[PDB]
Design a protein around this ligand. Structure first.
Ligand SMILES: NC(=O)c1ccc[n+]([C@@H]2O[C@H](COP(=O)(O)O)[C@@H](O)[C@H]2O)c1
Ligand SMILES: NC(=O)c1ccc[n+]([C@@H]2O[C@H](COP(=O)(O)O)[C@@H](O)[C@H]2O)c1
Ligand SMILES: [Zn+2]
Ligand SMILES: [Zn+2]
Lengths: 256, 256
């Protein structure tokens, strides 16, 4: 925890309220005074290729966007940046203590909120998430998400809920977004996600029953595409893509 | 959300600070005035066999204990009770808003904290957890946990951390508690846990390298026991036991 000076340079995660500053569509890299940043509080969340990445918790008029606007920067950088945004949001939600109501402060040893008056603390929360590829014979369920809009067709995902298992989270999510029923869930892998903090677990499923009834609020559209007649997909390096690949592998195994 | 009266009866989760009231070693069942409970605030967290279970957020001098003192009551009851304790702890940690510092109130529609001044809210957090059975040829790694003390020998478990995968959480936990290195992780299943709120994922692993170096703060002792010369185990119905069973099944498959 330091205060920025006139020769300070590197990567700057300037984050307010779920968004980060992205001038010219860029994650800012350079000197502090070039970014109107001198005299502010900055935390170092790590290093990219030997250069500090800083979290500055300040609002900016223009060019705030989503961290998943830097995904194609480097996954490693995105981990840093998403981690910054999460840490900013963590700090926002814990200025006061939920116990006793007096102002809290950041632990400089670890990454928690400590407390002046009382001795209770808070730690970052990890949200369990399911993600799933659904298979129906020669085809696989792909879909365009509403909030996304790159014209990509990916798999289904949703948050695990209270009192339920991964498998049940998959079944419910699939029921709600698509309106179909699945079977023979197979765990594939897991992958942490920076913002919001979450651990997604990857599942293959196969179609059991039902017709596609998209939640239009959530899904632009959903369709069964054959394993060799696919549309655009999430980029290689992403979990969703790996799942789709695994499914295509299943289909190939049966029909070729 | 109601206030208790003189003829109110049923199951009472009287919970303070991670503990619940267990008179005579019992989860209290009966009439309110019999339990000095009239005139207090009670929330209904559900029904056991058609009878209400109530959460009362009050301290009691004697006989407070751990919810995992009612595990052998009925799993369903324990879900209710553990859920009560969690909900009490949730309320304790969110009396004030972490944003703005003014007193918050419970959402009566869903189970969150709403806010008087501002419009930010909080929801219950689910903690990802790994649990793992480690296999070394004809044997399986079993261990007595320090905080437990029923003379039972169970599997290893620990909390998933930030920026890491399930598999990495397993590898690290196993490294720290036991000091050995594992390989060929296989996902088995997942199971939610009431208090503290967590979703544990079950893994089988096999021994790769190292000698047993127990964390004496965490583990009474750890040993390799053969699949047909076992000690006491966690009771049937529990995930740990199912894992141990699956492992024994592996051993039997190879050596018989
Ligand atoms: N190609 C992709 O865009 C891709 C692939 C795999 C996972 N994911 C991500 O998994 C993330 C999980 O995010 P949440 O934590 O909001 O569920 C999604 O936001 C999604 O972007 C994305
Ligand atoms: N036989 C047993 O006692 C048994 C079996 C399976 C899971 N578990 C539970 O998994 C629970 C996970 O608790 P945490 O959420 O504290 O990790 C452990 O507390 C453990 O009691 C217990
Ligand atoms: Zn406090
Ligand atoms: Zn508030």
């Amino acid at each position: 925890d330091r205060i920025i000076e006139k020769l300070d340079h590197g990567w700057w995660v300037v984050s307010h309220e779920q968004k980060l500053w992205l001038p010219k569509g860029e994650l800012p890299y350079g000197e502090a005074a070039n970014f109107d940043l001198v005299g502010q509080r900055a935390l170092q969340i790590g290093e990219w290729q030997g250069e500090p990445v800083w979290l500055v918790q300040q609002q900016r008029r223009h060019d705030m966007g989503s961290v998943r606007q830097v995904i194609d920067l480097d996954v490693g950088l995105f981990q840093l940046a998403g981690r910054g945004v999460q840490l900013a949001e963590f700090y926002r939600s814990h200025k006061y203590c939920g116990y006793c109501g007096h102002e809290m402060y950041p632990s400089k040893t670890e990454w928690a909120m400590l407390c002046s008056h009382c001795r209770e603390r808070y730690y970052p929360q990890i949200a369990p998430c399911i993600i799933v590829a659904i298979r129906r014979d020669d085809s696989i369920l792909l879909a365009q998400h509403t909030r996304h809009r790159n014209g990509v067709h990916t798999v289904l995902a949703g948050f695990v809920e209270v009192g339920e298992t991964l498998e049940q989270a998959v079944a419910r999510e699939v029921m709600e977004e698509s309106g179909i029923k699945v079977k023979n869930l197979r765990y594939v892998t897991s992958q942490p996600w920076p913002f919001p903090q979450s651990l997604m677990t990857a599942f293959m499923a196969e179609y059991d029953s039902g017709d596609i009834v998209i939640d239009p609020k959530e899904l632009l559209e959903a369709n069964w595409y054959r394993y060799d007649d696919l549309p655009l997909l999430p980029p290689p390096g992403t979990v969703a893509r790996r799942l789709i690949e695994d499914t295509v592998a299943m289909c190939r195994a049966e029909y070729e």
